[PDB]
Design an enzyme around this catalytic site. Structure first.
Site, short mmCIF file in Angstrom:
data_model
loop_
_atom_site.label_atom_id
_atom_site.label_comp_id
_atom_site.label_asym_id
_atom_site.label_seq_id
_atom_site.Cartn_x
_atom_site.Cartn_y
_atom_site.Cartn_z
N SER A 103 0.82 -1.21 0.00
CA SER A 103 0.00 0.00 0.00
C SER A 103 0.86 1.27 0.00
O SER A 103 0.64 2.18 -0.81
CB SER A 103 -0.97 0.00 1.19
OG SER A 103 -0.43 -0.69 2.31
N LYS A 157 8.46 -4.22 4.36
CA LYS A 157 7.69 -3.17 3.70
C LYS A 157 8.37 -1.82 3.90
O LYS A 157 8.96 -1.58 4.96
CB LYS A 157 6.31 -3.09 4.34
CG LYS A 157 5.55 -4.42 4.34
CD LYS A 157 4.06 -4.17 4.53
CE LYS A 157 3.72 -3.96 5.99
NZ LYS A 157 2.25 -3.70 6.15
N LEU A 187 7.42 -13.88 6.72
CA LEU A 187 7.40 -14.27 5.33
C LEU A 187 6.75 -15.63 5.22
O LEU A 187 7.23 -16.63 5.77
CB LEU A 187 8.83 -14.35 4.78
CG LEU A 187 8.97 -14.67 3.28
CD1 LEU A 187 8.68 -13.43 2.44
CD2 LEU A 187 10.37 -15.16 3.00
N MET A 188 5.69 -15.70 4.46
CA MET A 188 5.01 -16.96 4.29
C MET A 188 5.65 -17.75 3.17
O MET A 188 5.59 -17.36 2.02
CB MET A 188 3.54 -16.68 4.08
CG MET A 188 2.99 -15.94 5.30
SD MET A 188 2.51 -17.08 6.60
CE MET A 188 4.00 -17.65 7.31
N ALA A 189 6.33 -18.82 3.56
CA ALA A 189 7.06 -19.68 2.62
C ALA A 189 6.39 -19.98 1.29
O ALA A 189 7.06 -20.00 0.25
CB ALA A 189 7.47 -20.98 3.31
N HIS A 190 5.07 -20.18 1.29
CA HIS A 190 4.43 -20.49 0.04
C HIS A 190 3.64 -19.40 -0.60
O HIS A 190 2.84 -19.69 -1.48
CB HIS A 190 3.59 -21.75 0.14
CG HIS A 190 4.39 -22.97 0.43
ND1 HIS A 190 5.30 -23.48 -0.47
CD2 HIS A 190 4.50 -23.73 1.54
CE1 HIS A 190 5.94 -24.50 0.08
NE2 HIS A 190 5.47 -24.67 1.30
N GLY A 191 3.84 -18.16 -0.16
CA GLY A 191 3.14 -17.05 -0.79
C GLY A 191 1.66 -17.02 -0.58
O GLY A 191 1.14 -17.63 0.36
N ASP A 192 0.96 -16.27 -1.43
CA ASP A 192 -0.47 -16.15 -1.31
C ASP A 192 -1.16 -17.46 -1.75
O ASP A 192 -0.62 -18.23 -2.56
CB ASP A 192 -1.00 -14.92 -2.05
CG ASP A 192 -1.04 -15.12 -3.56
OD1 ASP A 192 0.01 -14.98 -4.23
OD2 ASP A 192 -2.14 -15.38 -4.10
N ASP A 228 -11.79 -7.36 1.65
CA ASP A 228 -11.21 -7.96 0.47
C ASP A 228 -10.67 -9.37 0.73
O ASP A 228 -9.58 -9.74 0.26
CB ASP A 228 -10.14 -7.04 -0.14
CG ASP A 228 -9.67 -7.50 -1.50
OD1 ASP A 228 -10.47 -8.09 -2.26
OD2 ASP A 228 -8.50 -7.28 -1.83
N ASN A 278 -5.64 -12.85 -0.89
CA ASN A 278 -5.37 -12.19 0.37
C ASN A 278 -5.16 -13.07 1.59
O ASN A 278 -5.31 -12.63 2.73
CB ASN A 278 -6.39 -11.10 0.60
CG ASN A 278 -6.17 -9.94 -0.37
OD1 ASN A 278 -5.04 -9.67 -0.74
ND2 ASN A 278 -7.24 -9.34 -0.85
#
Ligand code: EMC
Ligand code: EMC
Length: 303
Positions: free
Chosen positions: A26, A50, A98-103, A152, A157
């Site tokens: 954002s 970020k 950090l999420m190892a597998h992304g979204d 959202d 997300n």
């Protein structure tokens, strides 16, 4: 009005090393990096960092840090958490897990039979889907308990950890590989129309009840490996279909208990939809043994 996090949450700048950019947030770019001694028992931890864009005003820079202070109050295993902040000097950094597998959306798509990036893992089993469902509903229950209306909620997300736990969280990428997931209803603002409850579309209002609708869509995304909801309809068609009472087709080879749960989420009257706590209550009996150890549902905080 600069509101800073407790001393425990301040990270020495020298402990963060930015590695590569993950994408837009954002307030500005988000990077993958390494943070030293930020988590107990770990010398180094991969993190998402970020930053605020260099064109941001002072006000926006302050707002960027104040948001981190807010996010600091969201501590739940099922919500991506703030690990720390480098508030002094430039640039200010908000360190997130950090999420190892992304979204989830990209993760689900990678599980497709012919995906080039297929992990060599099968699409989620009924058991895994129910687990994901309870983790998502549980994090949403925590957030709703904090009076937060997501607005959202969608697989894009949500994020997937190394052990496949699904958490509520996103960097702020409306525009990304998922730009098509948003449409300027009436030529106005970008709205995640295919995830929106009929009342949000009709009156623009968003509540935890409209969040529940979206949660139903997320369940549907797990079943369809994140196809586009109402893929056969254009954005304008989705608006009419949904406002008229339409909802997504019941998935194939999916238990009545699950599809019924999806149907409940898609009840036209928001008042008839389950709450997130009810969703968890409904699935609690068949989850991973650790669930009671980490859920907001089984916590002393669920009051
Ligand atoms: C233990 C609250 Hg998620
Ligand atoms: C993804 C099992 Hg109904």
């Amino acid at each position: 009005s600069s509101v800073f996090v407790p001393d425990e949450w301040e990270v020495s700048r020298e402990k963060i090393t930015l590695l590569r950019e993950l994408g837009q947030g954002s307030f500005g770019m988000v990077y993958e990096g390494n943070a030293r001694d930020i988590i107990k028992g770990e010398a180094e931890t991969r993190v998402a960092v970020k930053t605020v864009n260099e064109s941001a005003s002072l006000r926006e820079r302050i707002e960027f840090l104040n948001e981190a202070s807010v996010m600091k109050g969201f501590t739940c295993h099922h919500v991506v958490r703030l690990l720390g902040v480098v508030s002094k000097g430039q640039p200010t950094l908000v360190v997130m897990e950090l999420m190892a597998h992304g979204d989830l959306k990209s993760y689900l798509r990678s599980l497709r039979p012919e995906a080039e990036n297929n992990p060599g893992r099968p699409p989620p089993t009924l058991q895994e889907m129910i687990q994901m469902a309870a983790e998502i509903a549980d994090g949403m229950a925590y957030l709703n308990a904090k009076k937060f209306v997501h607005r959202d909620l969608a697989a894009r997300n949500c994020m997937v950890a190394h052990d496949f736990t699904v958490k509520i969280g996103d960097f702020g990428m409306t525009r990304d590989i998922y730009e098509t997931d948003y449409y300027r209803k009436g030529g106005k603002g970008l709205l995640p129309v295919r995830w929106m409850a009929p009342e949000s579309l009709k009156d623009g209002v968003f509540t935890t009840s409209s969040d529940m609708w979206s949660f139903g869509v997320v369940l549907w995304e797990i079943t369809s490996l994140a196809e586009q909801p109402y893929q056969g309809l254009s954005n304008e068609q989705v608006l009419k279909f949904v406002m008229d009472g339409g909802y997504l087709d019941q998935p194939d080879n999916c238990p009545e208990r699950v599809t019924d749960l999806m149907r409940m989420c898609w009840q036209f009257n928001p008042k008839m939809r389950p709450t997130f706590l009810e969703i968890v209550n409904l699935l609690k009996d068949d989850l991973h043994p650790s669930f009671p150890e980490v859920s907001f549902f089984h916590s002393e905080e669920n009051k």
